[PDB]
Design a protein around this ligand. Structure first.
Ligand SMILES: Cc1cc2nc3c(=O)[nH]c(=O)nc-3n(C[C@H](O)[C@H](O)[C@H](O)CO)c2cc1C
Lengths: 203, 200, 202
């Protein structure tokens, strides 16, 4: 489980294609001693498993994950090249504060940024979700974009607004995010329980 | 996310103006040592991000958050001045229970208290919410008013009642809350997903 | 509490009737020196208290738990016989990593397996859920079945699908599980929250 609070910005060192997927090495600020093989780290909102870590005793700070078929088709990862900075988040450990909402790291699809507007030291992004995701995005509800849990500030059909506070613009990749950029989108899982109940009551 | 149960009354120390925003220093009973930079704290129902804490070796207990367009546009933070007592609540920890009402800190706007009647050891508050929020106010449904999970009692269009017990009046800012005041309103997160799903 | 990642398959050594409950002795691969008295162990999704251990200097490697009327009514324990293999998990201490989802070990009812279709090294399980639980079993949501953390891949009426990977079948009792079997179900926090708010409509 995650919460959508980014704790580090990582850089992609290597991109190596494999069967069904790709292999990624990500330079990080995390201490690799605190990471075990087969742990989950959300990379730009995508739950990925650690497969390789630095030789123990080493000081180098990176980890390796594999992306697969479902990941490459749905997510932004297929466009990821060396030098790309991404949002990172470690899994919630028992007792950790759940700052945003319940983010699972399972990306539904991709949303395009159509407008970027400055709001002083804050920035307001406007995005188009794919039609199939629109019903699950509500005003003053939650969403997970690039692994960042955000408040939906206004919605018109499949288009919606988010405001990115100054702190987040500093500690996340959203500072370099510009109009025309495609981000990973994870709708609030709490919405699927609203759909389920309604669909169950229609039978 | 939060449970909507207030665990301290903070006090606004300073309001320093920013570029389309304001910096807030909030005096609290919380131990700063237990607050991580970037943490979320529900300040009177508004979920804000901690950006600064006191220096090491300082014997003060405060935190700093920044409020921007949406927070100022919609919440009571627009009127916040030094000396103002506010409700505080920490984020919910993984392993704790989500008993009855989840508060996410996404406030829709301001409700206005229009009447304050005493009822024994308790006080009944009659409130009036913005037009758009009337359909969400369903009798006996939960709502977050100044970050306090309260059951909506009697309801007349956009008018509704909440009942606050003696203990609630002592540990929250509701005890000092008088007729005419503005409170933050957060509608149930699950209810808003339902109505959005309904408009299809 | 627990995560739904099963660390051992245990075998029920013997079933002893108590005055209003049952005493169970469970054989385990867990190191006897690590199991304290009064500890919590999730037995096929049911959080039970360790009540008895072997004597001082004993070689035996078992522990004992006691199940009560609440568990015997709700859980699969009432049918557990000697030699039954059950899923085991140790309790999480504060600060522990969590590779599944939050599991309290408090089951809500029993789910009935209705299908077992192979998908190569993965196996798809279709299950029938109680009426009270069915409206709060959502697609892509989390669930605990026999104490194992699983994701609901498809939901239709009172029947839902979960997928089990080759490793999960090798290390949990799902490798022996088949059509007709009753399993222990605990819905996750969000499902419980939605359920808490639906039952509140009275
Ligand atoms: C985890 C989280 C942190 C937030 N932090 C801030 C913040 O630091 N400043 C701010 O103006 N708004 C913030 N918001 C949005 C704010 O709560 C919202 O605009 C108001 O509650 C009005 O709905 C945050 C929202 C979430 C979900």
């Amino acid at each position: 489980m995650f919460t959508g609070i980014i704790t580090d910005i990582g850089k992609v060192d290597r991109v190596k294609p494999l069967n069904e997927g790709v292999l990624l090495r990500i330079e990080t600020a995390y201490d690799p001693e605190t990471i075990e093989l087969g742990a989950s780290i959300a990379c730009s909102g995508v739950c990925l498993t650690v497969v390789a870590l630095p030789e123990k005793g080493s000081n180098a700070r990176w980890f390796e994950v594999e992306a697969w078929e479902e990941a490459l088709r749905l997510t932004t990862i297929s466009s990821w090249q060396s030098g790309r900075k991404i949002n990172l988040e470690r899994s919630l450990k028992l007792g950790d504060e759940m700052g945003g909402h319940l983010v699972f790291g399972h990306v539904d699809g991709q949303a395009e940024i159509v407008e970027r507007k400055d709001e002083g030291d804050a920035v307001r992004f406007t995005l188009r979700a794919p039609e199939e995701l629109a019903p699950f995005i509500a005003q003053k509800g939650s969403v997970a974009l690039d692994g960042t849990s955000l408040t939906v500030n206004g919605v018109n059909a499949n288009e919606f607004d988010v405001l990115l506070i100054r702190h987040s613009l500093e500690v996340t990749t959203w500072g370099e995010r510009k109009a025309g950029d495609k981000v990973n989108i994870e709708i609030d899982q709490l919405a699927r329980y609203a759909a389920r109940l309604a669909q169950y009551q229609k039978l």
